[PDB]
Amino acid sequence: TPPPTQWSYLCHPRVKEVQDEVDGYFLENWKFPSFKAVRTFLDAKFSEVTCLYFPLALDDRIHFACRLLTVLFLIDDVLEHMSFADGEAYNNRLIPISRGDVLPDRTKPEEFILYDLWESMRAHDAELANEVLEPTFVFMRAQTDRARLSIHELGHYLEYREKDVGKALLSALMRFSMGLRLSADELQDMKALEANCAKQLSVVNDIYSYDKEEEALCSAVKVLAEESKLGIPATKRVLWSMTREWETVHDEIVAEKIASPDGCSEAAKAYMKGLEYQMSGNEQWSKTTR
Secondary structure: OOOOOOOOOOOOOOHHHHHHHHHHHHHHHOOOOOHHHHHHHHHHOHHHHHHHHOOOOOOOOHHHHHHHHHHHHHHHHHHHHOOHHHHHHHHHHHHHHHHOOOOOOOOOHHHHHHHHHHHHHHHHHHHHHHHHHHHHHHHHHOOOOOOOOOOOOHHHHHHHHHOOHHHHHHHHHHHHHHOOOOOHHHHHOOHHHHHHHHHHHHHHHHHHHOOOOOOOOOOHHHHHHHHHOOOHHHHHHHHHHHHHHHHHHHHHHHHHHHOOOOOOOHHHHHHHHHHHHHHHHHHHHHHOOO
16 A cells, blocks of 8 residues: 555566575575574565565675575674573674684584674675674674663654664675765765655665564654554555655755766765665565565
């Protein structure tokens, strides 16, 4: 029931091969705790998600993104079940290894998978590989801290999502996967568009995750439904409405930077189009998942 969108999602052409390859890799190395754990793992189709997010990734780089997002999802799950303290230590052990400053204990998959991944990434393109490092660490460190006083206004909720460390990681990983080389100025002048993108991705995620998220929460669906005193079906229709307006905001900012006097590099252009795909791909995926 979502209103019409001007964008068309796209899935990476090599999704089939890459998914078998990467899922395969983890089935060979990750210490799943049970066969049911494995069913759960395969049902997630992390490589398909990655391929819907970065349909323009270079053919020889898309597997890197799948491997990185997969291991990070696995890790995120591990951290969710351990105390704040043990989680702190988990990351502290892994980050140095990810930097390649510490050799991995060959009997600990969480150690050697990350080590081999990052090494192979730098080996492919060290300059961009390193552009993804920090965002990754900021992200895994943010998976330990709990609390988070549930927000209740629409503005503050969106402002909060704009700064989502995960969405920031996606954009960096995307530049690497597409081989995009942007200047510091270009990236800085990109913040607005990025904020809008992060915001759009969230609301769409929320719209589709509200139902299942019912048991006993940070959701634009909950936040707006209360502020406006509308029912869930209605609230959702309104969020869909806004979502389409933010897609239009994206188009205006893009056209504005392209028709700009100072010009717009091919890398910048490719980057903006990449964000478009993140949003359209995210929807296509949320629209057909779990």
